[PDB]
Amino acid sequence: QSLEESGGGPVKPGGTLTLTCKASGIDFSSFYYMCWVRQAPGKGLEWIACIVTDITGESYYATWAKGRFAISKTSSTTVTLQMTSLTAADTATYFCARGDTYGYGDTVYALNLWGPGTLVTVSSGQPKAPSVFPLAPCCGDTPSSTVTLGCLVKGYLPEPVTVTWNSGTLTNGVRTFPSVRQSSGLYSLSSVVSVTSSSQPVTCNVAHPATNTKVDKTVAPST
Amino acid sequence: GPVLTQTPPSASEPVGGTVTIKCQASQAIDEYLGWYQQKPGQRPKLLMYYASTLASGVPSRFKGSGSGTQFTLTISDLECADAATYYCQNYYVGSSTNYAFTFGGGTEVVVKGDPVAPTVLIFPPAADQVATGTVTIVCVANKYFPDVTVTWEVDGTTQTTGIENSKTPQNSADCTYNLSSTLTLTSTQYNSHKEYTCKVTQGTTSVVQSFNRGDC
Numbered sequence: 001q002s003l004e005e006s007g008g009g010p011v012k013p014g015g016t017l018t019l020t021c022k023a024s025g026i027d028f029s030s031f032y033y034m035c036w037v038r039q040a041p042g043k044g045l046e047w048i049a050c051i052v053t054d055i056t057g058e059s060y061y062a063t064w065a066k067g068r069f070a071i072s073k074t075s076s077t078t079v080t081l082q083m084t085s086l087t088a089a090d091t092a093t094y095f096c097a098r099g100d101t102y103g104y105g106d107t108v109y110a111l112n113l114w115g116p117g118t119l120v121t122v123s124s125g126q127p128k129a130p131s132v133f134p135l136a137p138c139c140g141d142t143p144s145s146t147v148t149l150g151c152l153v154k155g156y157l158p159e160p161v162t163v164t165w166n167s168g169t170l171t172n173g174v175r176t177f178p179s180v181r182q183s184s185g186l187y188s189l190s191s192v193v194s195v196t197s198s199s200q201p202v203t204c205n206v207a208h209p210a211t212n213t214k215v216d217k218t219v220a221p222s223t
Numbered sequence: 224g225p226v227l228t229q230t231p232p233s234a235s236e237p238v239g240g241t242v243t244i245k246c247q248a249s250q251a252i253d254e255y256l257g258w259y260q261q262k263p264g265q266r267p268k269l270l271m272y273y274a275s276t277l278a279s280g281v282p283s284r285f286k287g288s289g290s291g292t293q294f295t296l297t298i299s300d301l302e303c304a305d306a307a308t309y310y311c312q313n314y315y316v317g318s319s320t321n322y323a324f325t326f327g328g329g330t331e332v333v334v335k336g337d338p339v340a341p342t343v344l345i346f347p348p349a350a351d352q353v354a355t356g357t358v359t360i361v362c363v364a365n366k367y368f369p370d371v372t373v374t375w376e377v378d379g380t381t382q383t384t385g386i387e388n389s390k391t392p393q394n395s396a397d398c399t400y401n402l403s404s405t406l407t408l409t410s411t412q413y414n415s416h417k418e419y420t421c422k423v424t425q426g427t428t429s430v431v432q433s434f435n436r437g438d439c
Contacts, residue, residue: 035324044326045259045312047312047325050324052316060316060322060324097267101316102316109273110278110312111314112269114266114267115266117266131355133349133351133359136346137346138347138435138439139439140438140439148344148363150361152359175365177401180387180388188359189389190389190403222439
């Protein structure tokens with residue numbers, strides 16, 4: 001049994017999003033609470049609403065969420081969360097979660113199942129693709145059997161970007177740092193990889209889904 | 224419904240050690256209380272429900288207790304892999320007018336390994352960034368514990384603006400961090416100075432890496 005959220009992305013303030021949660025590999029002979037929980041950047045978990053999956057379709061809302069948010073069971077495997085009058089205060093990762101109903105006290109009465117979450121970014125800014133710059137040690141440096149190379153991924157909106165190295169051939173010894181958001185609202189991050197120095201090129205592959213862009217940068221040893 | 228207050232806001236304990244963290248409810252909630260683990264960049268994981276019942280697959284070195292308004296989670300034999308934020312939650316439906324699903328504010332748990340000084344790398348901006356009118360100098364501090372502070376110098380002058388730092392989660396095997404520090408300058412500023420220095424300090428230890436723009 002698993003959950004997966006979708007429908008997240010950038011939106012302008014005042015805008016409206018509808019998230020859906022897909023349940024897979026579930027037991028139809030049992031009833032559950034399906035819940036939405038969000039988490040603002042660097043902040044704690046915040047419960048939004050739950051709905052029971054029986055014929056009643058009864059729902060339970062956080063006080064602050066009454067009015068702007070609407071949960072509903074739209075199928076035997078799908079629950080949706082409607083969000084209106086969005087503010088940047090609503091920028092968060094949105095999780096779908098499931099837990100058991102009370103039964104006879106014999107159940108897992110907590111949220112035992114969680115989706116990976118979907119990112120919602122409320123911003124007036126238009127989506128913007130990152131610029132990508134190679135990071136190599138200074139030319140004056142003594143060569144070694146190994147070298148650490150990198151890519152700087154600068155000035156994009158919104159999260160996320162994905163960074164791979166040599167299309168996934170290089171995975172060990174990669175460090176991709178958490179993004180930092182500038183006061184402009186744009187994001188930047190860096191990624192580095194340590195390699196055995198060789199004739200084979202080292203290339204970072206940077207994707208930004210929100211702008212449907214994909215860029216490769218081959219990092220010269222700077223030698 | 225009830226407000227859940229977690230303490231401490233952050234705890235740091237050594238590998239192999241034992242930590243007890245607290246969750247307090249503003250009104251009685253019987254044992255309708257769950258505990259969750261959330262590692263940076265990951266989804267929450269249920270550890271404990273009905274205050275003291277272990278979730279499936281969770282080791283008995285996690286132990287929950289309490290009822291009414293005062294609850295505890297105790298983690299023993301701490302591993303670097305246990306570094307995470309831990310949340311409590313009221314989970315309860317009595318009726319359409321009596322329910323609660325609210326979380327506590329979370330407790331961050333840092334797991335302390337042996338101290339190790341970082342190795343430090345510095346990366347001058349590439350020619351094509353210089354062409355844009357803005358450059359970013361990147362400094363990376365690898366595999367270190369405990370936390371560092373970063374200072375930047377340009378021709379000996381300490382930088383007071385343009386610096387951004389980003390720290391990775393604790394390594395699941397050895398508890399260490401990695402850090403990227405960047406210094407952003409105009410291309411004019413960059414081309415007007417010679418020596419660029421990243422200094423990474425842990426108490427009475429510092430590791431310093433530099434380059435000279437003329438040499439790149």
